């Protein structure tokens, strides 16, 4: 078919939208509410307006190309329409970029600047308290920034299929929020924060823990531990203009020391701990023939999904604590035993690509003897802001090293942040455990990649077992609802709520939609992790020397005794009751 765009003739067989055909041919069209191959069906932002000859102004993002269209993307009538829409958005928008947390990478600001748009009347609310919801342990809303673009609603729908983020009719006016405007925590919401990632502005954010951290750092008698997740070292460089897929591990350690932290450890150490315990439990369940299947339990997004939708699976969850919590538990017990610190004075902070980790850390029973496993969780974005506020030249920092005692990690722990990561690492140790051997082939490439549902057959000690990797919360629903779970007998199942794994977590750096169609963000971030695994000497969690010492000298044998006593956590379904 033949179309004309800005006087340029195209002959094409492609059946796509104006927007995508234009972007494919280096023709500029703006968009706002269009994301994840979806726009806002009930309140189209119309930022993507173009002029079609013989029709008038149309939305490019959801209008298919047709033979014989004459399209103008830059006529004065088009630009005045787009400018008008942005101005109306400004009319309901607290335009104060100064102290805003999206100041450095906001899509809306870029649009305002591009079209020179201004409000008819500035939005200047005196009392923000009614626009702000900070009840959640993981999420916050600032409706002074909200454009009602529906991108959070669509993303929540696509990524989780819970539809926990909804349009609401609050006293005759439209907002976004949880069901019945309740606290997100009190709904079926997973707190995975995929909504935040989709948000073009600062309307959706993580629940801040930065005050917890600063207060602890400035408290004389507090000994503040910090440990970052696998994914952080593969991501945080993005916010310092270092590009995508840059390993910045050593720079992070240096920055944390300069921030005033008293001990620099690593969650990857906790990852090796979780494998120690979970691979042990797997081997146990084999020689007890059940309960099968065993599900991973390190994703609090998935744990909440199970609690809210599949409580019959809670007893199938591994009882091993997550790397975050299992690390935290040892930081209040083992670490004092090798440091002399009063356990009460230890304050443990993690850096996570995740918002759901904050909820996990603040679970009432995630403590012992009055001591929280984890006292604070800051996202990748929060650590970045903290670094920038301290004016630490991150990109120029020299590499330092972590403190070894709870900072060493194997290549198995290092790949936790990728979908299929926990599966692969668990298998490397479960195999060696069950066969009493030191096997050389350790790469399970079949469980890797961005496929939503991944299965593999594995041969453990002259017996064959079935594993599955569930990549994304919506895929958990598909896997269960479509009866896939009953099509064969599964023995070990990994579930991550965020598609791509933690590298694509709700607390990660935002990425411009244009960059998203240019960079495979999930694969590129994960590539850093697998790279570290490939070039590390020890690639099994039980080959972690610092970890072995810890178990030999303090916890004893994994999966039992002291180790099972305090390094494990069991989820329980509510007892039957009526009503509901
Ligand atoms: N706790 C824990 Fe995990 C580990 O190790 C993280 O820290 Fe993850 C990452 N990156 C997060 O958030 S959680 C899910 N298990 C996969 S990776
Ligand atoms: S959300 Fe964007 S446009 Fe609005 S105040 Fe913040 S930086 Fe400025
Ligand atoms: S919270 Fe963000 S993504 Fe959701 S409607 Fe408001 S501006 Fe759009
Ligand atoms: S945190 Fe996750 S489940 Fe909850 S509303 Fe946001 S995207 Fe949906
Ligand atoms: S996949 Fe990772 S980042 Fe996403 S909710 Fe689970 S633990 Fe958090
Ligand atoms: S981007 Fe097309 S209507 Fe919003
Ligand atoms: Mg649409
Ligand atoms: Mg201090």
Numbering used by the authors: 2 to 581
Paper text:
[FeFe]-hydrogenases represent one of natures’ most effective classes of redox enzymes catalyzing the reversible reduction of protons to dihydrogen (H2) at turnover frequencies of up to 9000 s-11–3. With their low catalytic over-potential, [FeFe]-hydrogenases represent excellent models for a regenerative and likewise economically feasible H2 production. Their active center (“H-cluster”) can be structured into a standard [4Fe-4S]-cluster ([4Fe]H) and a diiron site ([2Fe]H). Theoretical studies suggest that the most probable PT pathway comprises of strictly conserved residues E282, S319, E279, and C299 (from surface to H-cluster, numbering corresponds to CpI), including two protein-bound water molecules (Wat826, Wat1120 4XDC19, chain B) located between E279 and C29915,16,20. In this study, site-directed mutagenesis (SDM) is used to investigate the PT pathway of two [FeFe]-hydrogenases, namely CpI and HydA1, which represent the largest (M3) and smallest (M1) type of monomeric [FeFe]-hydrogenases, respectively.
